[PDB]
Amino acid sequence: GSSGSSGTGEKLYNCKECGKSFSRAPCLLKHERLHSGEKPSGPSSG
Ligand SMILES: [Zn+2]
């Protein structure tokens, strides 16, 4: 019963794919994007 979030953005950075809590938020947010399925085969254009 102690609900109270100080701020404007009520979001908690945390990877659910592999399940790992990084120390750096910035790096964590990017880590969540790194989880793009399996075998990221880009377009390889050019
Ligand atoms: Zn992860």
Q: Per the structure, how many domains does the chain have? A: 1
CA of residue 25 to ligand 1 center, whole Å? 13
- Please name the method used to determine this structure: NMR
CA distance 40 to 34: 10
CA of residue 44 to ligand 1 center, whole Å? 25
Burial class of residue 1 (count of CB atoms within 10 Å of its CB; 0-12, 13-18, 19+): exposed
Q: Which residue range is the domain that position 35 belongs to?
A: 1-46
Q: Are 28 and 15 in contact (CB under 8 A)?
A: yes
CA of residue 37 to ligand 1 center, whole Å? 11
CA of residue 46 to ligand 1 center, whole Å? 31
